[PDB]
Amino acid sequence: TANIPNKLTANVRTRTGKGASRQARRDGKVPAVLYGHGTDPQHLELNARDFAAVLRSHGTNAILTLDIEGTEQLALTKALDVHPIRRNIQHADLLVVQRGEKVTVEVTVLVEGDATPGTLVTQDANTIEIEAEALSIPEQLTVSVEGVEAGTQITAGQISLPEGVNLISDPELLVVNVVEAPSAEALEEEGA
Amino acid sequence: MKTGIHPEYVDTTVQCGCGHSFTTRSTKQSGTIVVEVCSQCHPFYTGK
Amino acid sequence: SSSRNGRDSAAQRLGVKRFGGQVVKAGEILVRQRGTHFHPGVNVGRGGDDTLFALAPGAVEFGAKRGRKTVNIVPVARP
Amino acid sequence: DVRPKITLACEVCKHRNYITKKNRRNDPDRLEIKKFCPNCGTHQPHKES
Amino acid sequence: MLIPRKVKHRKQHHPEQRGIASGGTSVSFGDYGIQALEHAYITNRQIESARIAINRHIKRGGKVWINIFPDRPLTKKPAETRMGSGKGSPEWWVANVKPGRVLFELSYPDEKTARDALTRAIHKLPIKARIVTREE
Amino acid sequence: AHKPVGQNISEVRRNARLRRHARLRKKVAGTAEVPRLVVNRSARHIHVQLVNDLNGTTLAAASSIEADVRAIDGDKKAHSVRVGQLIAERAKAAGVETVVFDRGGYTYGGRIAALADAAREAGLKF
RNA sequence: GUUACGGCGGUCCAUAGCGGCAGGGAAACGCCCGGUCCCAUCCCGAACCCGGAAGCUAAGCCUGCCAGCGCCGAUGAUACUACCCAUCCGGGUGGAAAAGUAGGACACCGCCGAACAC
RNA sequence: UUGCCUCCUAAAAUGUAACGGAGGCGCCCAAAGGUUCCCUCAACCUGGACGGCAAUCAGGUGUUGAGUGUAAGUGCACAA
RNA sequence: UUUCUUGCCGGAGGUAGAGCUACUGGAUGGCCGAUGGGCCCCACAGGGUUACUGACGUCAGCCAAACUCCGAAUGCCGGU
Ligand SMILES: [Mg+2]
Ligand SMILES: [Mg+2]
Ligand SMILES: [Mg+2]
Ligand SMILES: [Mg+2]
Ligand SMILES: [Mg+2]
Ligand SMILES: [Mg+2]
Ligand SMILES: [Mg+2]
Ligand SMILES: [Mg+2]
Ligand SMILES: [Mg+2]
Ligand SMILES: [Mg+2]
Ligand SMILES: [Mg+2]
Ligand SMILES: [Mg+2]
Ligand SMILES: [Mg+2]
Ligand SMILES: [Mg+2]
Ligand SMILES: [Mg+2]
Ligand SMILES: [Mg+2]
Ligand SMILES: [Mg+2]
Ligand SMILES: [Mg+2]
Ligand SMILES: [Mg+2]
Ligand SMILES: [Mg+2]
Ligand SMILES: [Mg+2]
Ligand SMILES: [Mg+2]
Ligand SMILES: [Mg+2]
Ligand SMILES: [Mg+2]
Ligand SMILES: [Mg+2]
Ligand SMILES: [Mg+2]
Ligand SMILES: [Mg+2]
Ligand SMILES: [Mg+2]
Ligand SMILES: [Mg+2]
Ligand SMILES: [Mg+2]
Ligand SMILES: [Mg+2]
Ligand SMILES: [Mg+2]
Ligand SMILES: [Zn+2]
Ligand SMILES: [Zn+2]
């Protein structure tokens, strides 16, 4: 299941620094860096609005097609430095990638469906590491809860993992734990 | 092997009660022992 | 209504006394310290209270020798 | 005192050369040690006064 | 009340209350949380009131994580006394809060009730906070 | 496969010897004018080097594997005295009569003492 | 000069470590055999010390390959900061981390000796 | 409370105040001083009659978490 | 001119910040699961069942004037 890369435009940062980054961030642009086996850390401003839009559409983990001054590159979002408060993305890290390339990544895990009513489902690890190709990276994968029995644990090793993707996390990492819903005489008994 | 601090040690002749002869060395000042129950006498040793 | 503390001792003025590239006489003490934070280096001796001093004239210079910060005296050329 | 001041004198010239301390509880007898005598010129026994 | 079993030193200086929360700025245990916006001293009184507020509002089943601990003591010298004679005896406990730190976190099925319990807690705190969700 | 579990006496001998050598080395060293006479010793041979620690170089050396030394029908002390006189002659040729003795982490005595006293009488003052 | 060699060293002493898999015994390095002699055990010829060459690559030693653990580690951003603007907010110019990422690394350099055509 | 010593305050040289925050000292050891040589702990697992997690024995793992007369700090396994 | 300023060069720090599976303490929630808890067959042997309490460990998020695997800017010492 190939995911189509998203087409952004970028242009080489003329000069570097906190003043330059603050100014660029002020003009609705995100400073970022390309690296990888391209062996050239290349400093690129890109459109903040388009960056946020594509991150909304295809999560944190999505291939991009960068147009660097006409040259055409394939990139993959490695990290995003984001402000804790203003929540704007400050910086981005872009591994260079090509087809048929396995890469390690972290994919969010969103529990889906309703559970049995007497107990609450609670996730400890929201993200699971997987090894997968550049184009075949899943932006999210689901875990099944449909009327479980009494409280039991779920680990990464029993998830319906996609095709062409490989678990990296040790299979005994807990993801979602159904824990019995606290009674009336049990909910306010902890916390002091 | 110190000068004289260790106890006296000489070769000794050990004879079993059931007829076995042991040629050994011990601290016995005499150097002579006879034993009535030995490695060929006990029911556990020789199955008897 | 009273503080059960309020005592301290005199400051002993410890620390590095001659820094790198500084010309010293033979016998000048170079760093006062408690333990051996700086270990004696080449042509540098150590005193009774762990005071490092120079055993020859030259220029001070620090180094690291098998994970040990050391102080050495380097013979400057005679003009 | 239990660690009083004591003096050491050379036997062969009876000059008191050194003063030290020692524990009387642990060294009840006179302390004697081979010290250096400046006028005898050499090392001599020195005994407590 | 949340009180440390022992502190190595019982009379410290006032916690420096400047900067932005660098550590502890994400919601990880539950799905909704209360995330701070101002520097303050959140005492165990505030924390207990806020936790009881959340429990009263949801009242059925759901997990409340108090991922801040009041373990820093503020002292107070006895009343009617002049200045001097040394520092006082410690008599309340505090967490040092920076703008950015998620204070309380909640896990509960529905949305509106969870939000309302979180704002009920917020009203008991000496700061401005906001409700933050498990996703960017 | 038969995986061994213990430590061998070779390891303890080798590294304890090295530790003794280093403890010794904390206090002796070699210049150009007073070099260091370092010694190795095994069950078959004894080795000596004359070292200038300012460089990590060796000025003269000898062992009990040379033609003449293997030509001696005598005892290990005889090989030791031969090595001592040879290294003394080689040092004297190299232009040195003062040295410091690095006994190499072995206890001074036996064949090492024989070597050292042979060098002592042969012209090297230490 | 060649060396699946032996020593003595050096390096802001792990980019060198730990672990794993696969080899070697020319001389060497070892183990190994014994306690007649120097010397030795707070008892023990186990260690140390002295003599010997029956057996060995099983170790130690060294060689080659593995990045699993430990180690090293940018660029960029950020934190913090000097000075300066600035009516609180905040900003500009210089310096710039820690953590993390890309990755690196199964050390390198030197001087003597051994055997080998010499 | 008043002299001395150690740490934090003390803003990475030194120095720095308050009836600021914590403790020690007014000794001790004829070896616990000098030198020479030798060794490496604490803890943990396994195997052992008393003997129990725990006492001494043996095997292993163990680079410093033990110990350093005596407060604290700086040191020390190259060992102090 | 030794003074002072600016540029460059040679230094020693443990502050701001940060980090803590790098120590000393605090401290949130999970996970497995002891030892010690109770019970059955029935012995106080032994075995398993059970809100057990739940050592140790481990996952993730944190905190410190007297914590530090780390770690600046300035200032300071010298040279030029
Ligand atoms: Mg002081
Ligand atoms: Mg001294
Ligand atoms: Mg003194
Ligand atoms: Mg006595
Ligand atoms: Mg401050
Ligand atoms: Mg945070
Ligand atoms: Mg932090
Ligand atoms: Mg409010
Ligand atoms: Mg064994
Ligand atoms: Mg390593
Ligand atoms: Mg061979
Ligand atoms: Mg023998
Ligand atoms: Mg082999
Ligand atoms: Mg070997
Ligand atoms: Mg490291
Ligand atoms: Mg940088
Ligand atoms: Mg204003
Ligand atoms: Mg880093
Ligand atoms: Mg200072
Ligand atoms: Mg300062
Ligand atoms: Mg003042
Ligand atoms: Mg007092
Ligand atoms: Mg002593
Ligand atoms: Mg002595
Ligand atoms: Mg042991
Ligand atoms: Mg200048
Ligand atoms: Mg400079
Ligand atoms: Mg520095
Ligand atoms: Mg400090
Ligand atoms: Mg801080
Ligand atoms: Mg503490
Ligand atoms: Mg600090
Ligand atoms: Zn018999
Ligand atoms: Zn006299």
mmCIF file of C-alpha atoms (C1' of nucleotides) and ligand atoms in Angstrom, chain G residues 14-15 70-73, chain I residues 69, ligand 15:
data_model
loop_
_atom_site.group_PDB
_atom_site.id
_atom_site.type_symbol
_atom_site.label_atom_id
_atom_site.label_comp_id
_atom_site.label_asym_id
_atom_site.label_seq_id
_atom_site.Cartn_x
_atom_site.Cartn_y
_atom_site.Cartn_z
ATOM 1 C "C1'" A G 14 36.662 2.720 25.536
ATOM 2 C "C1'" U G 15 36.337 5.329 18.009
ATOM 3 C "C1'" G G 70 28.859 -0.017 26.577
ATOM 4 C "C1'" C G 71 31.607 4.217 24.095
ATOM 5 C "C1'" C G 72 32.094 8.523 20.554
ATOM 6 C "C1'" G G 73 29.028 12.027 17.905
ATOM 7 C "C1'" C I 69 27.181 11.404 33.290
HETATM 8 MG MG MG J 15 29.914 7.188 27.028
#
